């Protein structure tokens, strides 16, 4: 993978590459308003340590924040999503695994109309990397989930619980 992260929009100002995974992007860039990934899919994240606000982005060239979802020019660590060979995921209604769970391959972008719930509080990922979202089609909060076990909704970053939709990372 390889993406190119710039301080200004449409791709100007001081720069950074990465082919890796990099937790503190703050030595490389005060800011970031655009990106060009050339290859990988790649997920931004506000804060260092792969915390905080998270975005996702495929191949192609991102002319200013908003074209990834951002809601800031805050970009401090980012992750090379690893090659997905398939892709499974469970879905649990409580916490620890417990409660209703659903099963999937393939995307689902209204999770409410399946559970009857509109949070989860467990899930393994079995196959592939997946980003969850907080609305319904593809909307709101991201979360990256990456093949393991998931306890509570903590575990994947997020505040609360609310999932709306659910994507397979191709």
């Given at each position: 993978?390889?993406?190119?992260?710039y301080?200004?929009?449409g791709?100007?100002?001081?720069?950074?590459?990465?082919?890796?995974?990099?937790?503190?992007?703050?030595?490389?860039?005060?800011?970031?308003?655009?990106?060009?990934?050339d290859?990988?899919?790649?997920?931004?994240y506000?804060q260092?340590?792969?915390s905080?606000?998270?975005?996702f982005?495929?191949?192609?060239?991102?002319?200013?924040?908003?074209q990834?979802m951002g809601?800031?020019?805050?970009?401090?660590?980012?992750?090379?999503?690893?090659?997905?060979?398939?892709?499974?995921?469970?879905?649990?209604?409580?916490?620890?695994?417990?409660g209703q769970?659903?099963?999937?391959?393939?995307?689902?972008?209204?999770?409410?109309?399946?559970?009857?719930?509109?949070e989860?509080?467990?899930?393994?990922?079995?196959?592939?990397?997946?980003?969850?979202?907080?609305?319904?089609?593809?909307?709101g909060?991201?979360?990256?989930?990456m093949?393991?076990?998931?306890?509570r909704?903590?575990?994947?970053?997020?505040?609360?619980?609310?999932?709306g939709?659910?994507?397979?990372?191709?």
């Amino acid at each position: 993978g390889k993406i190119t992260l710039y301080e200004d929009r449409g791709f100007q100002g001081r720069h950074y590459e990465c082919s890796s995974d990099h937790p503190n992007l703050q030595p490389y860039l005060s800011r970031c308003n655009s990106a060009r990934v050339d290859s990988g899919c790649w997920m931004l994240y506000e804060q260092p340590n792969y915390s905080g606000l998270q975005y996702f982005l495929r191949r192609g060239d991102y002319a200013d924040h908003q074209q990834w979802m951002g809601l800031s020019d805050s970009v401090r660590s980012c992750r090379l999503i690893p090659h997905s060979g398939s892709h499974r995921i469970r879905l649990y209604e409580r916490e620890d695994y417990r409660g209703q769970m659903i099963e999937f391959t393939e995307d689902c972008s209204c999770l409410q109309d399946r559970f009857r719930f509109n949070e989860i509080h467990s899930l393994d990922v079995l196959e592939g990397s997946w980003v969850l979202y907080e609305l319904s089609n593809y909307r709101g909060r991201q979360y990256l989930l990456m093949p393991g076990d998931y306890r509570r909704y903590q575990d994947w970053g997020a505040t609360n619980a609310r999932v709306g939709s659910l994507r397979r990372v191709i």
